[PDB]
Amino acid sequence: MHALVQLRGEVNMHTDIQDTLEMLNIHHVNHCTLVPETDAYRGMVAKVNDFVAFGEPSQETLETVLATRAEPLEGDADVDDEWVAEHTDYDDISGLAFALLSEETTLREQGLSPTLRLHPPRGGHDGVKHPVKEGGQLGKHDTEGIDDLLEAMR
Amino acid sequence: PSSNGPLEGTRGKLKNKPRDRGTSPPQRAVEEFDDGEKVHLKIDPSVPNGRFHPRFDGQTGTVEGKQGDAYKVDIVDGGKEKTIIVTAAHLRRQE
Amino acid sequence: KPGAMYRNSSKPAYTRREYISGIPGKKIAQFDMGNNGAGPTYPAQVELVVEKPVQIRHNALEAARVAANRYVQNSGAAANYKFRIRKFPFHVIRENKDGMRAPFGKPVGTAARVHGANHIFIAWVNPDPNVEEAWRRAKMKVTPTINIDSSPAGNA
Amino acid sequence: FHEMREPRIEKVVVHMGIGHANAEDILGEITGQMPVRTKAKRTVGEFDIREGDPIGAKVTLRDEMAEEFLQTALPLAELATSQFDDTGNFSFGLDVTVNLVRPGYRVAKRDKASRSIPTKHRLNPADAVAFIESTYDVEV
Amino acid sequence: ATGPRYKVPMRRRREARTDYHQRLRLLKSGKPRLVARKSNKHVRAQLVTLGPNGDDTLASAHSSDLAEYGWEAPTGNMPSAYLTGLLAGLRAQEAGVEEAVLDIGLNSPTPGSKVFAIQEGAIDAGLDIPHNDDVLADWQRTRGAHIAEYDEQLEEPLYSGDFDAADLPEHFDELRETLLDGDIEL
RNA sequence: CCUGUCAAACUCCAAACUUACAGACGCCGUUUGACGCGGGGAUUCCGGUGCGCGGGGUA
RNA sequence: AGUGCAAGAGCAAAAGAUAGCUUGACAGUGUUCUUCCCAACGAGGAACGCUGACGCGAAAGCGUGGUCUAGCGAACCAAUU
RNA sequence: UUAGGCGGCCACAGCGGUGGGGUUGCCUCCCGUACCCAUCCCGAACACGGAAGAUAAGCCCACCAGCGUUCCGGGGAGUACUGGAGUGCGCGAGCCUCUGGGAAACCCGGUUCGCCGCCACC
Ligand SMILES: [Cl-]
Ligand SMILES: [Cl-]
Ligand SMILES: [Mg+2]
Ligand SMILES: [Mg+2]
Ligand SMILES: [Mg+2]
Ligand SMILES: [Mg+2]
Ligand SMILES: [Mg+2]
Ligand SMILES: [Mg+2]
Ligand SMILES: [Mg+2]
Ligand SMILES: [Mg+2]
Ligand code: NA
Ligand code: NA
Ligand code: NA
Ligand code: NA
Ligand code: NA
Ligand code: NA
């Protein structure tokens, strides 16, 4: 399971790419979604490879992000341990986290918005004109690489 | 195009590779299809009759009745619905 | 007329004589030079390597070839070496000589398409590379920059 | 093995390539059965432009009819060698051709499952000379 | 054979066994096919239908297993063919088969020929086949009469030992008679 | 036999890709009625530019 | 090779060749595709049927002109069935 | 299938070549023209009738790879070309990097001298 984050805006981006971002529930820059590692999803992230940043996040970092930016399918409600236990199958954020990563469930399945609307990266990211392998911030990331970015946008 | 005949620009699609040259096996000209069955359209270069307009080469229709020995296949061209009169020689069971 | 008008490989290949008429004759006199009676039984084999795809008019071919071979007469009219220009000017070229109305031009020449790194000339010589010089003069008359390459020859 | 490998005559074609006939009459007597017209192909200068047009006749004799003809034909010829087919045939003379072959030829002349006669089973010039030579005359 | 671009006929045309063009026209009827085949010594009749991996023979009869019902005569003749036709026909009927079209392979449509004879027999057997009465033999020649009369110009028996000296078209009747009621494999 | 080259109107080969249909996931629709149908009212049929692919042309 | 004619495409127990017979180059009316991709638009054109009458074949069957893509013309008025 | 008949796929099956096989199930070559039927001339063919002889053809069986064809290994080649991205390079033609695809010729070594269906049958 990979964490997706849209790093480039819609103006000028191919329509079929945009649409794909849309079917992955992200509709704005800095929006993030968690996506299963399947043939069908892989094709989608690849298509979107050039306007996003993705990779497998650490249990920890998922937990930070979840807690900080997870939202109910509707409303303000903070997704904190309690919320999670009093609303989901799990007992606490951590247990939700582990289940996502092990792709045993999805944010929707647990009453949550599929979208983690992150905050701009504190300190700025590595640029949206080059992939990681080039010093930029686009494309697949290290689990260590994704974490840093997610964490920066916590 | 310089002209607008039916065979306009059909050189490749209406020409056999050298080894597939000459009359074709009848078994497939006699193939029977039921109403509802999905069939891919494709013209057999060897077979002159029971043909359809070259443009449809590639479509996968739904046989829906027949006319004479010829089948009536319903297809959708772009967004338009269409019925095509074609023989078993030029069809194939999908899957 | 300038090389600038035809030196790029930007138009389609146009070589079907069955559909073209009035093609000027090539000015290239020969492709095999030297002792053509002998086969590449030479110790040393240098080549003139073109460094960018381009078109080369039969004009430039003949001038580049004369200039090198006419010089390889540092070895004698019946000298021990064989020279070879491997490209032929297939590509028919036009000119629109009415303004831009009915402009598909009229055949005015032929040119050979050389990709960067192809060898256009190959010379065979015993340890006696005056040929290296025949080529400094030849790539002087073709559009591209060139590389003078030696293959069988570690007699340095 | 042999018996089924020994030569035999299969038809002797006697044709008169004229250029426009009254000649049939003689072929009919010299052989013993009706001749057949010889139309020609292509238009040519020898005022022979007519496509479908009688230009000679022929007669294909089989079995006895053939021998009984050769038994007078052959004597009138001398030649041999070089003048033989690579398949063991020969034509001499008015023409008189002699097609020669071995027992299982029908295989190549029938309708169903027909097939071409293997090169081994074909008759060689040599094996041909022998057969005929061994029947009232001499080779070369 | 010669190169990459060379065209090799289909196996059954190589062998000069199947006339595909005639085979298409036959298959159009959508009915089963009465395959009428001869040999120097025997005559075969099949009732073939179309299948996914190749023809299916639902009913057949060989001039050989004719004796199995009392045939003591040669088997590459007229009466022989008819009866094989009729025999295949009856096994056909038994099969639940009602109609077919005569496929005569590479044989020729000569009148009063053995294939037609095969045809006539299968018809009489209860099979509904498209036909033409005046291309069939005059019954008498189907009985083998032409042969009895041929042996009248005897001086030497037509049959080497075999059965009889003057032959029997009557033997013919006795057999058709036998096939038209009861018996095994029918 | 050996040796030197080509193809928009060549092909023994042959992609990426584009495309028909089906299933799966995805997204969407069943109080925001999609898909689709019928009808009223238009505007519009001088376009341009970047990129990729082009055809023509020295450009 | 040949298959009337451009160019491209089909064809070998044939779609070509020879022979023989025959007039389906038939009347009537349709279905569909095309003309006009998608997506409305006439004439025209084609593919595929039916009804009726025939031709040839043992028969399945083939013949809705020429192997396929060009060879085509509205209202009004006249003549004709 | 100790030899058959109808096929499907239509060369992995084509081309060439070697070996083996028949008082019988057989298939053929073969023998023979009174008949049905036949040749613009020939019982060659077609058609009919038949067993004196034969396994030489055909055919069936077993095999060979020299050509043609199919597929595979390793090499060519992740080369050529390419869908998406770039304030990367280049005077420019054009190149490069990242991401998702990915070839052709040719060479060397294997494979391929058909496979499968229904029927009939010491
Ligand atoms: Cl037969
Ligand atoms: Cl159509
Ligand atoms: Mg909300
Ligand atoms: Mg700051
Ligand atoms: Mg920046
Ligand atoms: Mg094209
Ligand atoms: Mg395209
Ligand atoms: Mg027609
Ligand atoms: Mg009038
Ligand atoms: Mg043998
Ligand atoms: Na074909
Ligand atoms: Na002017
Ligand atoms: Na230069
Ligand atoms: Na119309
Ligand atoms: Na005549
Ligand atoms: Na044999």
* Residue type at position B95: E
A27 CA – H22 C1', rounded, Å: 85
What are the tokens at B24? 């074709």
Which chain E residues touch D111 with a CB distance below 8 Å? 16, 106, 108
What CATH number does residue B2 fall under?
Answer: 2.30.30.70
B80 CA – F35 C1', rounded, Å: 15
| Chain E nearest CA to B90, separation (Å) | 15
Tally of structural domains, chain B: 1
| Residue ranges making up the domain that contains E58 | 1-186
Inter-chain CB proximity B18 and E9 less than 8 Å = no
Give the DSSP H or E segment for A152.
helix A143-152
- Residue nearest H83 (alpha carbon to C1'): A47
Sequential DSSP letters for chain B:
-----TTTT-TTTT---GGG-SS--SHHHH----TT-EEE----SS--SS---GGGTT-EEEEEEEETTEEEEEEEETTEEEEEEE-GGG--B--
Residues, CB-to-ion distance under 5 Å, ligand 5:
A 127
Q: How far is CA B13 from CA B44, B54, C62, E164, E177, in A?
A: 9, 8, 45, 69, 61
Q: What ranges do the domains of chain A cover?
A: 1-57+114-154, 58-113
Of B22, B26, B29, the CB nearest to E7: B22
Q: How far is CA B26 from CA B43, E46, E92, in A?
A: 15, 20, 25
Residues 13-42 (E) with a CB less than 8 A from some CB of B: 20-21, 23-24, 27-28, 30
Q: How far is CA C153 from CA C45, C125, C134, in A?
A: 7, 10, 17
**Under a CB-based contact definition with an 8 Å cutoff, are residues A120 and A20 in contact?**
no
Tally of structural domains, chain E: 1
Touching, C vs E (3+ Cβ pairs under 8 A): no
The CA distance from D56 to D33, in Å, is: 16
Token pair 């582990």 is found at A98
E4 CA – H107 C1', rounded, Å: 20
Residue E2 CB in 7 A reach of strand F: no
Question: What b/e sequence results for D71-108 when a residue is b if at least 16 CB atoms lie within 10 Å of its CB, and e otherwise?
Answer: eebbeeeeebeeebbeebbbbbeeebbbbbbbeebeee
Candidates E116, E90, E92, E118; CA nearest to E31 is E92
Rounded to the nearest 10 degrees, the angle between the axes of helix E114-124 and helix E78-95 is 40
The CA distance from E122 to E117, in Å, is: 9
The CA distance from A52 to A5, in Å, is: 5
Q: Which nucleotide is nearest to C6 (CA to C1')?
A: F58
The CA distance from D28 to D9, in Å, is: 20
The CA distance from C120 to C48, in Å, is: 6
D124 alpha carbon – ligand 10 mean position (Å): 19
> Chain H: nucleotides under 7 Å from a protein CB?
4-11, 13-18, 25-30, 34-38, 40-59, 67-70, 83-88, 92-94, 97-100, 114-121
| Chain E nearest CA to B20, separation (Å) | 7
The CA distance from C124 to A37, in Å, is: 61
Q: Which CATH superfamily is domain A58-113 in?
A: Ribosomal protein L30/L7, central domain (1.10.15.30)
**Under a CB-based contact definition with an 8 Å cutoff, are residues C91 and C26 in contact?**
no
Candidates C14, C112, C8; CA nearest to C54 is C8
User: For chain C, which chains pass the contact test of at least 3 CB pairs under 8 Å?
Assistant: none
**Under a CB-based contact definition with an 8 Å cutoff, are residues A134 and A46 in contact?**
no
What are the tokens at D28? 């009919």
The CA distance from C153 to C156, in Å, is: 7
Q: Any residues with CB less than 8 A from the CB of B55 and at least 6 apart, and which? A: B77
The CA distance from B21 to B45, in Å, is: 8
If phi > 0 it is left, if psi is from -120 to 50 it is alpha, else beta; for residue A111 that is: left
The CA distance from C28 to C68, in Å, is: 13
SS3 D13: strand
SS3 D58: strand
What are the tokens at C145? 């920059």
- Domains of chain D in start order, with CATH, are 1-140 (3.30.1440.10)
- Residue numbers 108-137 of E with CB closer than 7 A to any atom of strand H: 108, 110-115, 137
3-state secondary structure A41-110: HHHHHHHCCCCEEEECCCHHHHHHHHHHHCCECCCCCCCCHHHHHHHCCCCCHHHHHHHHHCCCCCCCCC
Question: E6 CB near a chain B CB, below 8 Å?
Answer: yes
| Residue ranges making up the domain that contains B13 | 1-95
Residues C34-37: contacts with CB under 8 Å, at least 24 apart: C34/C72, C34/C79, C34/C80, C34/C81, C34/C82, C34/C83, C34/C124, C35/C78, C35/C79, C35/C80, C35/C81, C35/C82, C36/C82
The CA distance from B63 to B67, in Å, is: 11
- Residue numbers 27-56 of C with CB closer than 7 A to any atom of strand F: 31, 39
What CATH number does residue E5 fall under?
Answer: 3.30.420.100
- Topology adopted by domain A1-57+114-154: Ribosomal Protein L30; Chain: A, (3.30.1390)
The architecture (CATH level 2) of C1-156 comes to Alpha-Beta Complex (3.90)
| Chain D nearest CA to E186, separation (Å) | 31
- Residue nearest H87 (alpha carbon to C1'): A129
The CA distance from B72 to B85, in Å, is: 5
Inter-chain CB proximity E4 and B69 less than 8 Å = no
- DSSP-derived letter for residue A2 is E
Experimental method: X-ray
Which chain D residues touch E105 with a CB distance below 8 Å? 112
**Under a CB-based contact definition with an 8 Å cutoff, are residues E104 and E117 in contact?**
no
